[PDB]
Amino acid sequence: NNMKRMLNNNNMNPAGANGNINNKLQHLNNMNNWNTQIYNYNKNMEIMNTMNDKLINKLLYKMMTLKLNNMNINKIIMSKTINQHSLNKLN
Amino acid sequence: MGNFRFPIKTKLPPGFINARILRDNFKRQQFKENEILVKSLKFIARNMNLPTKLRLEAQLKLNALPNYMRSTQIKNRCVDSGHARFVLSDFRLCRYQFRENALKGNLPGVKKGIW
Amino acid sequence: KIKPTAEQLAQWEALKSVPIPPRKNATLDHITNMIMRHGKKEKAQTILSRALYLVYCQTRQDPIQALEKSLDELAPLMMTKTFNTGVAKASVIPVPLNKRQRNRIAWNWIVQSANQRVSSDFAVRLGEELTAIAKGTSSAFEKRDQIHKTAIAHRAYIQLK
Amino acid sequence: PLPTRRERWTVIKSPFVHAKSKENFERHTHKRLIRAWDTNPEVLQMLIAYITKHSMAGVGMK
Amino acid sequence: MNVPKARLLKVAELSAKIFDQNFNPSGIRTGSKILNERLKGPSVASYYGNPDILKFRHLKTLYPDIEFVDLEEQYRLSMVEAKKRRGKGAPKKMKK
Amino acid sequence: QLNDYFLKMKDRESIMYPLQVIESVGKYNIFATTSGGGPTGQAESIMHAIAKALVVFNPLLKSRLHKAGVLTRDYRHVERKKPGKKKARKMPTWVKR
Amino acid sequence: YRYTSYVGEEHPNSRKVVLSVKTKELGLEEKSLHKFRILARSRYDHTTDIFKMSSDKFEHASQNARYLHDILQRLLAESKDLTEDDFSDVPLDTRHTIAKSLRKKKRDYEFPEHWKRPEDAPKKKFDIVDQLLSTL
RNA sequence: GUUACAGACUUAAGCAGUGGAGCAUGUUAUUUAAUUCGAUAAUCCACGACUAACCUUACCAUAUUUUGAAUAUUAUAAUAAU
RNA sequence: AAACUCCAUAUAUAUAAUUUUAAUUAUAUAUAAUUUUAUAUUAUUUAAUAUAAAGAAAGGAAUUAAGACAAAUCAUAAUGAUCCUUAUAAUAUGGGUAAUAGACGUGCUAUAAUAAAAUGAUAAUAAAAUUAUAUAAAAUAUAUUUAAUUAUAUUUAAUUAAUAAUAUAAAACAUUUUAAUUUUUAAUAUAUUUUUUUAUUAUAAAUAUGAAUUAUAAUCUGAAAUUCGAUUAUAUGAAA
Ligand SMILES: [Mg+2]
Ligand SMILES: [Mg+2]
Ligand SMILES: [Mg+2]
Ligand SMILES: [Mg+2]
Ligand SMILES: [Mg+2]
Ligand SMILES: [Mg+2]
Ligand SMILES: [Mg+2]
Ligand SMILES: [Mg+2]
Ligand SMILES: [Mg+2]
Ligand SMILES: [Mg+2]
Ligand SMILES: [Mg+2]
Ligand SMILES: [Mg+2]
Ligand SMILES: [Mg+2]
Ligand SMILES: [Mg+2]
Ligand SMILES: [Mg+2]
Ligand SMILES: [Mg+2]
Ligand SMILES: [Mg+2]
Ligand SMILES: [Mg+2]
Ligand SMILES: [Mg+2]
Ligand SMILES: [Mg+2]
Ligand SMILES: [Mg+2]
Ligand SMILES: [Mg+2]
C-alpha cells in the first residue's frame, strides 16, 4: 500500500498512452502563437514596442531581396519575424 | 506655404502615412509643445482672485491660439490603416484592422473570445 | 471495511418504511406560478396564501383542501378542441385534459370572477371568490356545464373511440 | 497565483455592415507572486539581477 | 456633530500646513484643478510611433556593399514607365 | 438568526428539506456561512451543503438523500449574453418586409 | 518605506514611495499621540493602529522618500509641541475607516463554542500492525 | 398550385411585446449653398458609425498652397558629429 | 459531421507563512461520462418505455463545408484599368451632416392599486470589469433650518491594484401613502374591531397617473455650447 502511494505521488511521464503531462517537445508554447512575445506593465510602452517590431519586420523584408550588378536578383524568402522580449533583451 | 502644409516642419510618422494622419500627428506635436503654456493661460483666465484685466487678456490669448494648440482637436486614428471609427486605445487600430491583426497573431496577448 | 454502527443501522431501518416527503403541494405551486408574472414569485405566494387565510377565516375548514375541491368541481374534464380537418368543415373533437390544464381552465375563470369583486387588493378579491365557490355560487360553474354540453354534442367525433 | 485578468473586446467581423455578426476577443494577464522573507539587501539585489539576466520571453516583472 | 466647528477648521488648517496641501475654508474657485492636472502631451505625441526608424534609404548609407532592392518602389517605377509609354503619363505641372 | 437572514419562507423550507427527508430536523445544530449570489440561491447552496454534511453522520441515508434530490449539485448556470442577441436567447426583432 | 521598481519597463509609478508606521511604535507620549492621529486624519486607520502616506509629486523615487520623511518629521514636531495647542477635545474622526469597511466585506462571525461536541469526535482507531512496526 | 414522411421556434399552446400615444434613433421623401458617401427583400433601416459642437469630414461658402508626405536624379551653399 | 478546444461543473494534488485573504478563495496540473448496471413490459440477439442503485454529473460558447446569390464592401486597407494634376491634390475660418409635408422600420417612456411613490446606518443579499492620455474616498460649502437624500463646488486621502477607488447593488421584504371611489375625510356621540367600529350631520372621463412641450435661473465639459451638448432648480403639465 505504501509502495502504491509512493508510485502515485511520483507517477508522471510524457502524455500519449491509451499521471502524465505534455512535455516541451510534445506541444507548442502558446507564446509561439503571437509574434511579439512581450508583457509590459505600462500598456502604452507595450503598444509602442509592438509597433516598432512591426516596422522592423517590413525593414527586414525590404533587406531580404538583393541584386548582383543588375545580373541576378536572388529573392531570399523570409518568414514573419518573432520578437522575444525578455526583461534583459529583445531577440 | 509651398514647402510644407503646416507652419512647423514636423517629421512623418513611421509606417502608414495618410493626409488625415499627417494632419492629426502635427496637431498632437503642437499640443505637446504648447501644453504647459495653454494650461497657464487657462489658469489665469479662470481666477476670481487675480486682476480682471489680466484674466481678460489671458482669455483673449487663449481664443487667439491656433487650431493645432487645441487638445480637443486631437482624434485617435488607426495606426495600421488611417481610419477614425471604432479605434481601440489598447492597440491603436481600427475595428476591422484590429481583428485582422488579432487573428494573425500580431497582438501581444489577443485571441478568440470563446468563453 | 465500512463498519456501520448499531444506532445508525436502527435509524436507517426506521427511515426505510417512511416515504420521501414531497417538497411542494403541486397544484398550489402551479397556481402560484400562474398568478406570478415578472419572476416575482414571492408576491404571488403572499397573495395566494393571504387569500387562503381569508377563506379559512370566513369558513373554518382546511383552505387548501377546499380550493382543490373547487378546482376539481370547476375543471372541465374535456374540451371541444377545433381542427382544420384536411381543408373541410372544422370538425371539433372532445379531447381529454391533463390535470394542470383542467385546473388552469378553472383558475382563469376564478380570477375573472374575483376581478368583479370590490376591493383594491386582488388577494382579498381572490379570497372572497374562493369562499363563494366553496359555498357554491359562480358563473364559472355555468361555463363548465356549457362546455360539458358542447362536448356531449359530438359524441362519436372522437377518432379511436 | 493572483487572479488572471480578462481584457475583452468585441468587433463586427465584416469590413462593412453585417453588424448582426460580431466576434469577441480576449486577453488574460496571468499573475504570479513570489515573496522573499529574510535577506541582507545585497543578496536580494544579486538575486533580482540574476533573475533579470536570464529572463524568459513572455514574462514581465515588477 | 456635537464637536465644535471652529476647532475642526483649525485642526484641518493645521493638517494642511503639515502636509503640502492647501486649506480653502471658504470654498471659492481657486483654479487649483487647472494646474494640478498632470500634463498628458508627451504620451499624445508618441501615438503614431518613433519617427526616427530605419528606412530603405539608410535598408545605402549603412551598408553600401549590398545592392538592395526596394520592391514596391521598383514596381511603382515600372508602372510609371508603362504609363509614359502608352500615353497615360502625368501632365507636366504648372509653375506660374 | 435564520428568520432574520432568509425572509422568504420558501428558502427556509428548502434549507430544512435535507433534515426533513430524514427524521432529524431538531437533532442537528447547523451553522451555515454563505457568500456570493442572491438569497434563494444562497439558501439552496446551504441546503446542498447540509445534505453532504448529513451524509457523513450516517452513510446508509446517502442513497435516500440522493433520491430526494438534495445530493445533486444544481448545475443551472446563467447563460451569457451572445453578441447579436439582446440577452442569452432574446433576439432583436426580425423584419421580413 | 516600500519602494517599487518595474524591471524592463520605465513606468511612472517607479517614483512612488510609501511610508507606513504603527502609531504606537512611534516614540510619543499619550497626549502627543492623539494630536498626531488627529493631524493624520484619513491617513491614520484606527482598527489597525497604522498611519501610512505615499508621495508621487517628485521626479525620482529617492526624492519622494525624502519628502515623505520630512513630512513625518514635521508631523512628529507638531505632535510634541503642546504649547497653546493640545487637541484634547477633538474626538478621533473614524468616518473614512467605516466607509472603507462598508466597501469591503466582513467574516466576523464564528462557530458557537457551546455548540461543540468533543465527545462526538472520531476517536483514535487501534491499528495493531502499525503499532508492531513502531519499534523506534 | 405534388405523393409521403421527417426537420425547428416553422406552426400550435403559453409569456411578454410591436402596430394606437408622445419621445429617441435609423431610413425615405422633399428641402438646402451643403443636408458627405455607402447599406436599402429574406441576407438595409441604434447598419458601416464603440459617442458628428471645432476636430472627426469625406459635403458647402470664402480665403489661400502648388514637387507639395514619398523615392530617385543633378547642382550650389551652410551647420554639426567624428 | 462527431471528437479533441474554451467556459462552467465534481474530485484529487500542488502553492498562498490565512495582513494583497475571498481558503466559503485563486491558478497550474491531472482524473471524470457522447454515463453505467440490472429487473420487467411491448416488439423483433437487440431497441423503446417503466422501475430500481451507482454517480456532482445538467448546460452554454467557438467551429457554419462545397457551391451558389456577378449578395455586401474600391469609405478599414491595398491593387488593375480609367479620369483630375493651379486641381477631382493641400491648409485655415464659419456653415452642414441635427433641415421637415406625408411615410417606413427599430427602441424608450408611458396610459395607476395581482402597482406606483416616501422611508429602511450595528448599512439584507451579487457578479463581472475599469482606474499613469487616471479612479477620485472621506470631510466642508451652497441649493435646503435642522439632517439625510439628490446635485454641484471646495480638496485630493488611498491605488496604478487579489492590497485603495469607481461602489453601503437593485428588485426583494416591512411600515406609510395613493385619485378615480360618500369604497374617504371631520364634528359629535358610540364601544369587549380603539393605527378601529356603529349612528347622525356636513363632505358635489386624465389625477396626488404621465412627463411631452415651453419660460427663467444656475452648474458641467471645453479655447468655444448660436445653429448644436449634458445636468440641477423653480414654474410649464400635450398626447396617452
Ligand atoms: Mg407564435
Ligand atoms: Mg405609425
Ligand atoms: Mg408608436
Ligand atoms: Mg464609393
Ligand atoms: Mg444616407
Ligand atoms: Mg476631396
Ligand atoms: Mg464539430
Ligand atoms: Mg481568509
Ligand atoms: Mg459554404
Ligand atoms: Mg451586384
Ligand atoms: Mg452597392
Ligand atoms: Mg481602387
Ligand atoms: Mg478640393
Ligand atoms: Mg473647417
Ligand atoms: Mg446621422
Ligand atoms: Mg438593429
Ligand atoms: Mg402607475
Ligand atoms: Mg465623498
Ligand atoms: Mg478594493
Ligand atoms: Mg441597502
Ligand atoms: Mg385627454
Ligand atoms: Mg406626476
Side-chain angles (χ1 to χ4, degrees):
Chain A
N1 191 241
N2 198 288
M3 190 173 157
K4 280 187 173 185
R5 182 184 65 84
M6 298 247 294
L7 287 166
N8 289 10
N9 279 283
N10 298 30
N11 189 229
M12 281 296 151
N13 266 277
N18 193 49
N20 43 39
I21 52 273
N22 281 44
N23 297 330
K24 290 185 162 60
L25 319 106
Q26 296 212 138
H27 78 122
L28 258 178
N29 214 121
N30 290 313
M31 264 288 153
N32 295 316
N33 304 340
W34 303 289
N35 298 313
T36 56
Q37 296 172 232
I38 188 176
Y39 185 92
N40 284 175
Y41 280 69
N42 48 353
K43 262 63 208 304
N44 185 312
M45 180 47 55
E46 191 180 297
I47 290 156
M48 192 176 181
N49 278 299
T50 200
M51 280 188 191
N52 266 305
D53 291 333
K54 261 195 257 175
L55 292 166
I56 302 321
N57 208 1
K58 299 287 181 65
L59 209 233
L60 278 158
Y61 273 53
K62 259 86 173 189
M63 288 165 69
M64 285 296 107
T65 308
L66 304 322
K67 198 202 287 281
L68 187 71
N69 209 337
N70 216 125
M71 191 182 179
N72 305 320
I73 296 163
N74 60 319
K75 304 173 75 167
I76 294 160
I77 305 306
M78 191 185 63
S79 64
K80 68 196 172 178
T81 55
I82 63 192
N83 308 260
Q84 317 192 248
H85 294 256
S86 77
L87 297 166
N88 177 194
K89 75 169 66 58
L90 174 60
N91 178 82
Chain B
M1 226 300 172
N3 295 38
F4 212 63
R5 296 176 176 188
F6 323 105
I8 316 307
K9 260 285 205 294
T10 57
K11 297 187 189 178
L12 306 182
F16 183 81
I17 294 162
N18 192 12
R20 288 153 196 197
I21 281 178
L22 229 321
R23 212 186 311 169
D24 192 66
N25 179 50
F26 162 74
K27 229 171 288 188
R28 293 178 112 96
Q29 296 320 305
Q30 293 303 308
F31 167 68
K32 192 264 269 285
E33 213 73 2
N34 302 291
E35 229 286 60
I36 159 273
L37 163 276
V38 166
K39 170 192 265 60
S40 191
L41 289 167
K42 193 180 174 179
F43 174 70
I44 293 157
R46 312 301 176 74
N47 220 315
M48 312 313 293
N49 299 323
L50 284 170
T52 311
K53 183 261 189 70
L54 179 58
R55 102 187 274 184
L56 194 156
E57 190 187 344
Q59 188 61 72
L60 286 170
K61 197 157 271 75
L62 284 172
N63 203 285
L65 286 172
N67 190 74
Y68 45 83
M69 261 60 145
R70 326 264 67 163
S71 68
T72 342
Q73 281 271 343
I74 306 307
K75 182 68 178 68
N76 287 20
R77 287 273 172 190
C78 174
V79 173
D80 282 44
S81 59
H83 209 52
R85 292 194 163 285
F86 215 136
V87 178
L88 311 181
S89 65
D90 300 58
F91 339 73
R92 299 142 177 173
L93 275 90
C94 154
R95 165 189 68 77
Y96 186 85
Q97 195 62 24
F98 156 84
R99 187 180 103 87
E100 172 196 323
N101 276 246
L103 293 170
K104 286 163 184 185
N106 275 351
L107 311 187
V110 183
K111 48 144 171 289
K112 272 280 285 299
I114 309 290
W115 275 249
Chain C
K1 295 181 182 179
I2 309 305
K3 297 181 77 218
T5 60
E7 187 188 337
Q8 281 180 41
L9 206 299
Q11 189 270 352
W12 176 70
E13 283 183 321
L15 258 294
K16 193 174 172 186
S17 59
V18 175
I20 289 162
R23 197 166 155 186
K24 301 182 171 189
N25 192 346
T27 55
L28 288 182
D29 180 53
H30 163 100
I31 288 159
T32 59
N33 290 138
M34 288 201 301
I35 290 161
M36 153 180 137
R37 222 80 277 178
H38 301 317
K40 297 203 170 190
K41 202 180 177 157
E42 182 51 42
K43 192 209 181 165
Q45 188 68 234
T46 58
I47 286 158
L48 189 269
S49 73
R50 278 183 170 186
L52 298 223
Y53 170 102
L54 253 193
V55 168
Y56 160 73
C57 290
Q58 287 188 249
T59 164
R60 303 294 245 260
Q61 49 178 35
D62 188 286
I64 295 162
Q65 284 186 328
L67 188 140
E68 286 176 324
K69 274 206 171 191
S70 302
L71 261 50
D72 279 35
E73 288 164 30
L74 219 55
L77 291 152
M78 64 292 287
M79 277 288 293
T80 54
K81 294 193 182 175
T82 58
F83 289 91
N84 294 16
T85 321
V87 189
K89 293 176 188 179
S91 299
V92 304
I93 317 180
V95 185
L97 295 193
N98 194 12
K99 217 309 190 188
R100 272 199 167 197
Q101 295 164 30
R102 258 184 93 248
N103 83 32
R104 160 166 272 281
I105 287 165
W107 186 253
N108 295 317
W109 291 336
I110 289 160
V111 167
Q112 287 160 30
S113 48
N115 291 324
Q116 296 170 28
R117 308 312 204 81
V118 185
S119 67
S120 56
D121 197 344
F122 164 76
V124 169
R125 276 142 54 194
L126 216 193
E128 297 316 282
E129 195 49 51
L130 291 165
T131 51
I133 293 159
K135 290 163 183 175
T137 43
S138 188
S139 187
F141 289 114
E142 190 189 321
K143 292 155 101 172
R144 174 208 70 171
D145 282 29
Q146 185 168 217
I147 283 171
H148 278 311
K149 284 181 178 182
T150 58
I152 287 156
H154 320 99
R155 301 185 180 75
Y157 277 65
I158 190 68
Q159 300 180 0
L160 282 294
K161 306 180 183 178
Chain D
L2 310 327
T4 58
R5 217 221 231 212
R6 238 204 322 178
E7 302 139 70
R8 288 90 70 78
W9 351 76
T10 73
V11 152
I12 294 159
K13 288 182 175 176
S14 309
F16 179 80
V17 197
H18 318 286
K20 295 160 197 194
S21 64
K22 294 187 192 196
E23 188 170 69
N24 291 262
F25 283 92
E26 59 191 338
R27 179 161 71 172
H28 310 254
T29 300
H30 300 172
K31 301 175 175 200
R32 308 300 166 94
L33 187 62
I34 267 55
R35 333 188 88 177
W37 283 99
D38 284 315
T39 19
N40 191 309
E42 292 181 312
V43 172
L44 213 190
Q45 286 178 226
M46 284 263 293
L47 168 277
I48 294 284
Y50 197 88
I51 293 316
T52 189
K53 184 160 187 170
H54 306 279
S55 182
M56 231 164 180
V59 187
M61 203 226 300
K62 179 190 171 194
Chain E
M1 292 283 286
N2 194 49
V3 68
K5 189 195 173 185
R7 277 301 214 78
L8 284 167
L9 261 284
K10 176 196 161 191
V11 166
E13 185 180 3
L14 221 178
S15 77
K17 218 295 191 184
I18 287 288
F19 303 103
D20 281 18
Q21 63 194 148
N22 33 289
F23 170 70
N24 186 14
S26 45
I28 308 161
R29 297 171 193 285
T30 65
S32 184
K33 71 187 190 177
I34 284 74
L35 330 103
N36 198 78
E37 267 185 319
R38 61 181 65 172
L39 81 176
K40 59 149 76 173
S43 298
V44 169
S46 310
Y47 187 88
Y48 293 109
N50 189 351
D52 293 43
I53 260 288
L54 271 198
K55 296 174 179 176
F56 192 90
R57 290 202 294 100
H58 310 330
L59 346 179
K60 68 218 171 183
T61 303
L62 300 163
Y63 322 114
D65 181 39
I66 291 62
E67 297 166 41
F68 290 114
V69 192
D70 199 332
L71 276 290
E72 297 298 332
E73 181 60 31
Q74 281 291 127
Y75 172 74
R76 187 190 72 75
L77 292 171
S78 78
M79 291 303 307
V80 165
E81 235 303 321
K83 291 275 181 170
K84 281 184 180 180
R85 281 206 193 81
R86 73 162 177 281
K88 305 298 209 305
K92 188 158 185 169
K93 187 138 170 277
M94 189 175 174
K95 289 187 169 190
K96 200 177 182 181
Chain F
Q1 296 298 332
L2 177 267
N3 68 267
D4 189 34
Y5 201 92
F6 296 119
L7 308 177
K8 298 189 196 175
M9 271 285 298
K10 297 164 192 201
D11 294 352
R12 299 178 193 161
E13 292 265 40
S14 83
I15 287 164
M16 198 174 70
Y17 193 64
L19 306 161
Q20 197 177 226
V21 298
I22 302 163
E23 272 57 36
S24 65
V25 68
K27 295 187 182 169
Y28 292 101
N29 254 314
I30 293 178
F31 184 83
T33 68
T34 24
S35 61
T40 59
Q42 273 171 352
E44 235 76 336
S45 65
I46 287 166
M47 169 229 298
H48 187 55
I50 290 161
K52 303 225 270 80
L54 288 157
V55 152
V56 177
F57 286 112
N58 189 9
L60 310 195
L61 302 169
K62 201 225 80 134
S63 183
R64 201 181 191 285
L65 279 156
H66 209 293
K67 189 161 266 64
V70 206
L71 247 71
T72 82
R73 183 262 150 78
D74 189 279
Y75 182 77
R76 295 171 177 177
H77 188 60
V78 172
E79 287 183 44
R80 77 185 211 75
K81 176 179 149 51
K82 289 98 188 183
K85 296 128 190 178
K86 297 196 133 292
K87 306 218 271 68
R89 305 288 177 75
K90 194 210 179 168
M91 267 195 163
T93 38
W94 190 64
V95 294
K96 163 173 185 169
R97 180 170 72 107
Chain G
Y1 299 97
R2 88 133 183 76
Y3 303 86
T4 178
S5 78
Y6 296 76
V7 175
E9 304 92 49
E10 42 183 309
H11 224 265
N13 192 51
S14 192
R15 76 192 66 174
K16 189 160 185 283
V17 179
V18 193
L19 162 147
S20 53
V21 208
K22 282 179 166 57
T23 57
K24 292 200 82 185
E25 297 187 325
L26 296 167
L28 293 175
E29 223 71 53
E30 72 188 320
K31 267 190 183 297
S32 60
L33 208 196
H34 182 258
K35 177 159 185 190
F36 176 97
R37 279 167 183 171
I38 289 285
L39 289 167
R41 300 185 71 189
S42 56
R43 284 153 268 236
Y44 177 70
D45 186 67
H46 82 96
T47 57
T48 48
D49 66 310
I50 196 270
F51 158 79
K52 69 182 183 82
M53 45 160 185
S54 65
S55 68
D56 198 81
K57 309 218 308 181
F58 300 87
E59 297 96 54
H60 212 244
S62 57
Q63 268 180 83
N64 274 307
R66 220 281 183 76
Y67 172 62
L68 286 157
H69 164 59
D70 291 320
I71 288 159
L72 203 214
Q73 290 292 281
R74 206 182 303 166
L75 227 180
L76 290 164
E78 206 61 50
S79 76
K80 298 169 188 177
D81 185 45
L82 279 294
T83 55
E84 300 85 53
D85 183 41
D86 203 310
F87 297 146
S88 56
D89 60 306
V90 271
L92 195 75
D93 193 290
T94 60
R95 283 133 141 184
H96 59 272
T97 56
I98 75 181
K100 197 206 280 76
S101 77
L102 286 166
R103 250 135 263 186
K104 299 174 93 293
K105 267 59 171 176
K106 58 181 94 292
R107 305 292 185 77
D108 68 322
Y109 52 78
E110 291 189 321
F111 188 79
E113 195 163 32
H114 79 275
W115 280 16
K116 291 171 169 179
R117 292 294 206 79
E119 70 209 316
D120 288 52
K123 209 166 192 182
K124 212 296 191 184
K125 194 57 52 54
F126 195 50
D127 212 323
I128 68 99
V129 68
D130 290 15
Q131 193 64 232
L132 185 279
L133 202 156
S134 59
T135 56
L136 300 170

